Design a protein around this nucleic acid. Structure first.
Ligand SMILES: [Zn+2]
Lengths: 116, 49, 125, 85, 205, 134, 99, 60
RNA sequence: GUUUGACCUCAAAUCAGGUAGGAGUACCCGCUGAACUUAAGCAUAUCAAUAAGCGGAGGAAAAGAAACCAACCGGGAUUGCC
RNA sequence: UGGCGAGAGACCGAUAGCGAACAAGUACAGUGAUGGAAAGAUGAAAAGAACUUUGAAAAGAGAGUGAAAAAGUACGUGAAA
RNA sequence: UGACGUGCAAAUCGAUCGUCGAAUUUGGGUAUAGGGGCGAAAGACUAAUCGAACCAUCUAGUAGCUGGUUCCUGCCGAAGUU
RNA sequence: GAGUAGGCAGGCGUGGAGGUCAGUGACGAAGCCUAGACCGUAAGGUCGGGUCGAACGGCCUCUAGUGCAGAUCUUGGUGGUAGUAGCAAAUAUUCAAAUGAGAACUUUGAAGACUGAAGUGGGGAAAGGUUCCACGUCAACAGCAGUUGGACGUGGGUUAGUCGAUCCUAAGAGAUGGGGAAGCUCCGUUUCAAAGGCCUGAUUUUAUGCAGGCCACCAUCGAAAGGGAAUCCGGUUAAGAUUCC
RNA sequence: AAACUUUCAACAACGGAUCUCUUGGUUCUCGCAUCGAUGAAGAACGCAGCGAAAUGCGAUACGUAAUGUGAAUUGCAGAAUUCCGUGAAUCAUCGAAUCUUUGAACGCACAUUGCGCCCCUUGGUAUUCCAGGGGGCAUGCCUGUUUGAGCGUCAUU
């Protein structure tokens, strides 16, 4: 097939032109399979289409991460999933915020280390 | 019923595709416990839905 | 056994061997080295890869030797060239040998095997 | 009359396929499934049905998403990639 | 809930069949079959075994010690040691006492070399010739090999002797303070061949 | 009162449980009022309800709820705790003032049946606790 | 259903007790868990004791008042007498009982 | 006779055949097979003999 | 009677950002709720403040720092075991 | 008596043990709720029987493989009726 | 009170007969669900189930009642009455 | 020196457990078969011969899901009856050739018959689901047979602006507002609701603000026989056609 | 006297007990806390050179990307020395994606693969009709926005 590490070093339109060529190359191979007893070379083509499509998706998704970089309100698919419960859960700023009075107490009388 | 719903046609179509005996090259493989197609159904023997 | 995270359970050990995937059947199908090759490298036994030459040490086929054809991981066997059974019909079929009953008389040396040998502590390639 | 001759007139359907359960349980006059309770928020399943609960519990199907939740936890809900060494 | 997972009413009398719960109607083979019995093929066993059976047994601390004390007293006279297998026909004097140097042995080859010189190898080749297979279902329950019981090397202070002897098939190593009855009289048969150290034999009193 | 929802008043039991009319709900009307608002506004958390007014066929309550999603409440330490998902539907489990009352969660000889939890207490003193050495 | 001549017993097994029998096989398993739990707490609380200084206190109920026993926490009176604060006491490893 | 997808309009079959095979479609008649796949009878205008485009594709 | 602006209460929007359902349920917090059975009958009792039914959580839950126990030379949150 | 990951056993050993050691909540019954099976073992290795002869054929009798065919894919052993 | 009655059939067959333009026959749709329906009323019908359907559960319900209750030898040896 | 019910004692046998006999065993463990042998009052034990092929035993103790003829016991298998009862309603078949190893049953020809247009004709509804059609083929099924088949193996086949569905409402079912209910959810469908749509140019601000102004007790589902926009003829295939030409 | 019936043995049948095994169950112990509008559990339909299933996956369909290992896969075929290699694999790992149609299921329905409307863009000559592609339109509730309603109500005019 085609190697994805080669495809990352190409323009948006080079990939689109490679995809349509692979889709035509599957089309003509699907035509040959009708007459031929066993044509297992179609596998490498349809895995090469998936390889290109994944590289195109990955590159558009990197471009959209870059245009939404350094803001609140990112697209929910680009937000880190983790778990419904973990997203709902209080952050590290929240669940750590303490009152002025309870701050003053901890500064005054923290639990100390002793011996014997 | 000649005037099938597509939901019934889709399931008749899967039941048609499923109606074949075991391909006789899988009996050749390693450890292969399988002898014959156990889930084989005829239009006469047992109905569906 | 002193480490508690390991099991001395016959049932678990039998299943863990039989349902071992390809990558760990590499390590299960290991062969010891010849007296000469062990004197050269200084390593006891390696995982059999494809084109290593070996000698048969046990079985009816004891004494015969040659390059290994197929490391048949799925059958827990390695099929060796020139060690075959001719059927009644006159068509030859390779005999399934376990790699621990063989001995590695000649190594198939690539960058990853030189790396493996240096890692275990071999005093060459 | 009540037996063999009356069995001859069974040529309608009380239920067809349920959209949710996918089973010939959707009573078409009530227009509610007799197995999964569709249409309803809640899936019909009763404690007195020990076997029935077991037949439609988690792990009977594919678990498309839940399959890998164990792996994702184990790794710490990590994000990104490793590069090389 | 074993054999209890089915729904089965008896058919009463009037069907020429014998009153045992029978399975719900179907075209399957299971339909009309006996259920819930201890007699039936697939019912629950008569009085199914439960986990609140008394497994452990309390026995008086003073009875325990009496048995331990009598077991230690049997490690003396050779009549009982030889009666319990134990090849000590050649050995010099009963209760066999060794130096405090046997406590300090680190390695197995020197530990076994020390034991053989002191007088053993008859009772330590017994445990090598012994290793046979089990006679029943215990083989596929992790009780595969038999292996006879050799000498018990009782010590006072451990300087690596327990690790030294660990691997050697038959030999068991014990501290004098504890001194298990399960080891002092295996099979509830009196007179084990015990090798005491000098420190251990003095600590006994 | 709570009229028993049995049809035609027929109960199918023994005289002791032939009661239909004179029977009382074990939770309070504050609890019922908390429960129905909890269902209406599910995004918020019931802090505490209380009595406002009553006529012959009605009692009127004002439930104080909190938004656990509003930063205002999530950032203040004195009301950060409510956001923790072990406080989801307090009014339902019966952890509100009304619930704790109706469950008799109070210290003293007076509340021996229902102190640590009526059900927990029942099963604890109906548990047969056997040891290895009896 | 009555004896030859035997003491009248009160065996409270007319409920579904079989459904809530609790056998303590976990005794040995819990014992090493508690010892590990103590060892790890002493590694956390690195140079300090696991338990706080308890006060002496005379047991109530005239049956038992004949013997003294380690009470819960010292007191605001004893802490002030000894010459420290009820806050400072709690932090440097003394149980203080406000009650 | 072309094996079309399910979820494909007669409009989309006409448009697909024209764009790919470079041919003007006079009509498209579609039935779904008992196999559960769609097939479409793509009739061309008088201008294109179907054999010229059948041989172009490969199959005879 | 107009000029413009407030206020209060109630609305609308495919309004900016959000959140609720459902699953599972061994254990946990609640509600509701039997009969078989035991009583050698049976109606109170019993089974049982159990099964079933419904609402709701978490890794635990609940409880919990006294409107407590006591009557002592008094103890001192909560839970668990003996 | 749930989920995930591990250690175990004076437990069961294919009518036992979970209903399920097998493509088991599968096949199948019932309108439906629900009901719900049977079914493991050739040999170290298919070496799964070349080739000859009777028969239309299945197969037979040979020949052979095998340590054994008193192991032939109706396959360890092969009880009794 | 024919045939069949381990049938063609868990209600059929043949002859004979009731009625045959309406209180007629009947398809599809729809409503009524179990101490409930429906009943030109026989406790009839409510999926071959009806003087209270079917499914699961409580449930292994209880039984002063029937049946069964698995090696040998040795020694002793009853009751049917208060 | 009897003995039911019953008690007690001494042993026999089974699955496991600890100890021991440095036990037996691929030169053959265990299992099974044995009108062969020996021991034991007995439960049982031991040995020879065969088959077989991977484990098993004596003894001192521990432990139990531990010993079967009965339960109209359970599951599985097997019989005698028995080559028996029977395979007898829908009037009925017969000759020849072909095919084939084989023909009462298959194909063709030729007779003789029946259904007799309220049919054994030609379409459809519901229901089935590929049974339709072709080739190859007959181990199983078609209670005889089989070369045949609705069987078996591999394929082929269902073409719509006009036929239906889609739309409308019917008996009705049902969200909404609301009100009940601890709750599952129940009532109601126009109700004690602030319940959006329609058109003309406008004005040409890369097309957006007007007003001519109007109009409003208001979801949705519910008929392949009710209501309903529109198709006919001829020809065509192994099998489709009011569709293909 | 044959046949016939019964008993016993040998060999052959029927049948699948016994024995031996065991990738399974079962109970006990310990450790851990992780489902879902960012669409869960479950269902339907699809996907391989030859597959009906189980297992896997979703029109990127027994998988794609990444990482590790280091040379396979296997029933046949087909390849390939890229094999001193950014590299075989029905491998492991898994952090990037795809994820059909459904489903709490969310435009409205659903015994229909039914019927709408809004935005952008592309074709038919086209603000309006038809068609293609992409993005949308549920309900309750909270905070804030904007536009409003009410002699409920204040002040100015
Ligand atoms: Zn359903």
């Amino acid at each position: 097939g085609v190697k994805a590490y080669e495809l990352r070093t190409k323009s948006k339109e080079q990939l689109a032109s490679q995809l349509v060529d692979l889709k035509k190359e599957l089309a003509e191979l699907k035509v040959q399979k009708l007459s031929r007893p066993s044509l297992p070379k179609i596998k490498t083509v349809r895995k090469s289409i998936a390889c290109v499509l994944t590289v195109i998706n990955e590159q558009q998704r990197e471009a959209v991460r870059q245009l939404y970089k350094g803001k609140k309100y990112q697209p929910k698919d680009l937000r880190a999933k983790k778990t419904r419960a973990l997203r709902r859960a209080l952050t590290k700023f929240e669940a750590s915020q303490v009152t002025e009075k309870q701050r003053k107490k901890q500064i005054a009388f923290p639990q100390r280390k002793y011996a014997i | 019923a000649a005037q099938k719903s597509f939901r019934i046609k889709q399931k008749m179509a899967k039941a048609k595709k499923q109606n074949r005996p075991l391909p006789q090259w899988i009996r050749l493989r390693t450890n292969n416990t399988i002898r014959y197609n156990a889930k084989r159904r005829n239009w006469r023997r047992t109905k569906m839905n | 056994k002193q480490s508690l995270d390991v099991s001395s359970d016959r049932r678990k050990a039998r299943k863990a061997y039989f349902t071992a995937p390809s990558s760990q059947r590499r390590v299960l199908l290991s062969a010891p080295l010849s007296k000469e090759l062990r004197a050269q490298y200084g390593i006891k036994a390696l995982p059999i890869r494809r084109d290593d030459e070996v000698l048969v040490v046990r079985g009816s086929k004891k004494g015969q030797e040659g390059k290994i054809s197929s490391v048949y991981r799925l059958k827990f066997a390695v099929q060796v060239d020139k060690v075959t059974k001719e059927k009644v019909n006159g068509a030859s079929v390779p005999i399934n040998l376990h790699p621990s009953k063989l001995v590695i008389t000649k190594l198939h040396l690539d960058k990853d095997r030189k790396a493996l040998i240096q890692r275990k502590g071999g005093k060459l390639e | 009359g009540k037996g063999t001759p009356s069995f001859g007139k069974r040529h309608n359907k009380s239920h067809t396929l349920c959209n949710r359960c996918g089973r010939r349980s959707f009573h078409v006059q009530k227009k509610t499934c007799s197995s999964c309770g569709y249409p309803a928020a809640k899936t019909r399943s009763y404690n007195w049905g020990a076997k029935a609960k077991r037949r439609h519990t988690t792990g009977t199907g594919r678990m498309r998403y839940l399959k890998h939740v164990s792996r994702r936890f184990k790794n710490g809900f990590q994000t990104g990639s490793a590069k090389a060494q | 809930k074993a054999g209890h997972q089915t729904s089965a009413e008896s058919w009463g009398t009037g069907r020429a069949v014998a009153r045992i719960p029978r399975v719900g109607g179907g075209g399957t083979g299971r339909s009309g079959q006996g259920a819930f019995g201890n007699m039936c093929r697939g019912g629950r066993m008569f009085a199914p075994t439960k986990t609140w059976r008394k497994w452990n047994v309390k026995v008086n601390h003073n009875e325990k010690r009496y048995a331990t004390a009598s077991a230690i007293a049997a490690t003396a006279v050779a009549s009982l040691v030889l009666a319990r297998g134990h090849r000590v026909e050649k050995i010099p004097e009963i209760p066999l006492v060794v130096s405090t140097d046997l406590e300090s042995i680190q390695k197995t080859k020197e530990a076994v070399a020390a034991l053989k010189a002191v007088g053993a190898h008859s009772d330590l080749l017994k445990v090598l010739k012994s290793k046979k297979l089990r006679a029943g279902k215990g083989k596929y329950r992790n009780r595969r090999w038999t292996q006879r019981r050799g000498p018990l090397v009782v010590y006072a202070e451990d300087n690596g002797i327990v690790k030294a002897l660990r691997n050697v098939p038959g030999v068991e190593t014990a501290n004098v303070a504890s001194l298990n009855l399960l080891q002092l009289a295996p099979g509830a048969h009196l007179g084990r061949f015990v090798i005491w150290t000098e420190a251990a034999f003095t600590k006994l009193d | 009162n709570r009229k028993r929802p049995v049809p035609k008043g027929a109960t199918y039991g023994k005289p002791t449980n032939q009661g239909v009319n004179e029977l009382k709900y074990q939770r309070s009307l504050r609890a019922t009022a908390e429960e129905r608002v909890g269902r209406r506004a599910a995004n918020l958390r019931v802090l505490n309800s209380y009595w406002v007014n009553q006529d012959s066929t009605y009692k009127y309550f004002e439930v104080i709820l909190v938004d656990p999603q509003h930063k205002a409440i999530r950032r203040d330490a004195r009301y950060n705790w409510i956001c923790d998902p072990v406080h989801k539907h307090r009014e339902a489990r019966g952890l509100t003032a009304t619930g704790k009352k109706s469950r008799g969660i109070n210290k003293g000889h007076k509340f021996n049946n229902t102190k640590a939890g009526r059900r927990k207490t029942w099963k604890r003193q109906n548990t047969l606790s056997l040891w290895r050495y009896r | 259903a009555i004896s030859k001549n035997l003491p009248i017993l009160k065996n409270h097994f007319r409920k579904h007790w079989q459904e809530r029998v609790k056998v303590h096989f976990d005794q040995a398993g819990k014992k090493v868990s508690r010892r590990n739990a103590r060892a790890t707490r002493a590694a956390k609380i690195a140079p300090r004791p696991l338990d706080l200084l308890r006060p002496v206190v005379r047991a109530p109920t005239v049956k038992y008042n004949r013997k003294v026993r380690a009470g819960r926490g010292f007191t605001l009176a004893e802490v002030k007498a000894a010459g420290l604060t009820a806050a400072y006491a709690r932090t440097i490893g003394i149980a203080v009982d406000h009650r | 006779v072309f094996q079309v997808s399910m979820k494909a309009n007669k409009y989309q079959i006409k448009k697909a055949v024209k764009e790919l095979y470079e041919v003007d479609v006079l009509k498209v008649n579609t039935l779904v097979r008992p196999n559960g796949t769609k097939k479409a009878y793509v009739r061309l205008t008088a201008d294109y003999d179907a054999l010229d485009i059948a041989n172009r594709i490969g199959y005879i």
